[PDB]
């Protein structure tokens, strides 16, 4: 399993809730087709459709944000605002080095960024270092990590609609995990080439990057995802991407959240024709045993990288 890190360009802005893993897959596929043609893809479709992806997550230097596990354990009513857990903080929820149940006030007051991101104690001082925070509590510090802005564009008559633009802080980067689930070097190099082309290709819509680099998993991620470790036997698992279940994984789904993936409204001609949509489990859903996933059909990737979880 490898990590892809995308460092956004200086005045770049993105148009995509987070950027789901199926959109990443469509990007790496359009890049594969771009680099090697439409023919060489369907000679390897059965091997690109069996890669495992996480969604587009956020990285702050050496702090990796992961979605909040949709387990009821994590429910005044201010806890409905949090959506992220630093991978270190998430790991501390496994080794019980962080106590969610009886120490929530310390977590909410001293360890939460913008009321929405929970981190570890050992990351606090460097967070304060980066953004120049002198406040003794992080509760009393609003950090500008992203800048949102809705805009009213049309599709001049037709349908009016809003598009949300996101701008990243200079200390914030994108990242996502990739599992090739294969070892064909002649294929690996073309997947990593398709991933690397994003650098000049972009994401969304487009928002471009200054460097797209493929590296090895950081040591938290690797100490957690190594199959020759403790966490391997943990009975639950959390999605890091969208999940499109097959008829067999439906019996493994415990706590989850649903979203609808789908298509463009290519015309007004199709305002009479129904809208078939693909249901998927959001990032952070908990499944027992193992979630395999599926790839509907234009492809719709639904095999998410799982992350060992214990209640």
């Amino acid at each position: 399993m490898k990590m892809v890190v995308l460092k956004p360009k200086i005045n770049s802005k993105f148009h995509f809730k987070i950027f789901h893993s199926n959109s990443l897959f469509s990007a790496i596929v359009n890049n594969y087709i771009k680099l090697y043609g439409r023919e060489d893809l369907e000679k390897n479709i059965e091997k690109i459709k069996n890669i495992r992806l996480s969604s587009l997550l956020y990285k702050i230097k050496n702090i990796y944000l992961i979605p909040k596990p949709e387990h009821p354990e994590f429910y005044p009513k201010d806890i409905k605002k949090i959506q992220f857990f630093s991978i270190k903080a998430y790991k501390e929820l496994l080794d019980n080095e962080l106590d969610w149940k009886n120490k929530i006030k310390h977590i909410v007051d001293y360890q939460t960024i913008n009321k929405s991101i929970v981190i570890s104690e050992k990351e606090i001082e460097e967070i304060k270092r980066i953004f120049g925070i002198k406040a003794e509590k992080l509760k009393h510090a609003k950090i500008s990590l992203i800048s949102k802005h809705l805009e009213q564009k049309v599709a001049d008559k037709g349908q009016l609609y809003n598009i949300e633009f996101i701008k990243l802080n200079e200390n914030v980067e994108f990242y996502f995990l990739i599992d090739y689930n294969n070892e064909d070097k002649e294929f690996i190099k073309k997947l990593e080439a398709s991933i690397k082309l994003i650098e000049d290709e972009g994401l969304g819509g487009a928002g471009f990057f200054e460097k797209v680099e493929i590296v090895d998993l950081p040591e938290d991620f690797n100490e957690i995802l190594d199959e020759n470790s403790k966490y391997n036997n943990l009975e639950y698992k959390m999605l890091l991407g969208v999940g499109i279940p097959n008829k067999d994984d439906i019996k493994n789904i415990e706590y989850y959240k649903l979203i609808e993936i789908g298509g463009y409204i290519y015309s007004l001609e199709c305002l009479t024709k129904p809208k078939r949509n693909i249901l998927a489990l959001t990032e952070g859903s908990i499944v027992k045993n193992d979630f395999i996933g599926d790839v509907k059909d234009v492809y719709t990737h639904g095999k998410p990288i799982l992350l060992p979880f214990n209640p």
Binding site: I10, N11, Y36, K190, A193, D200
Partner: protein
Amino acid sequence: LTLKGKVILEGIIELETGMHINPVIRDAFGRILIPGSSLKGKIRALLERKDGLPHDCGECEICKIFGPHDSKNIKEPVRVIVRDAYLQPEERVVAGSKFKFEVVFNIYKESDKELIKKFIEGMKLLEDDYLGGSGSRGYGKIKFRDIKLICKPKEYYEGNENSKKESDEVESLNELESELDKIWGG
């Protein structure tokens, strides 16, 4: 038709004349910039006028570069993408202001050197005309300055870091045609 490489044309755009705020826009986030499609559009206009609703067919000098007006007529993939030129730090924009610009060339065939050259010649046509406006009375003159070429061949994305070569900065467009020839890998 596989992709052989990308050729990025990075540089600086400078204003000889003041500019109000079609050509110069103020971003939703408050940032001042020259929209890529405006720049590219005026380049289309001049580059088409010097050849006798933009052109729309498959095989043509202009339609292989900027792409045809309709997507139902694309024979070969679009080769050029003009990034938005954002204002650099150090209603009207003062003169001498610099916008860092970037132009991406998609090279598929080894005969697309003349396409890139045609676009650069378009830039030369724009340098001695006007950015904003069209036809009879344009406004705000512009000069290209400090221009580097970067080559990202197919071998670069595939893992070879050093296959990415970068020319050194030239002061004008005229000096590009040499620096172009000194860079051709694929």
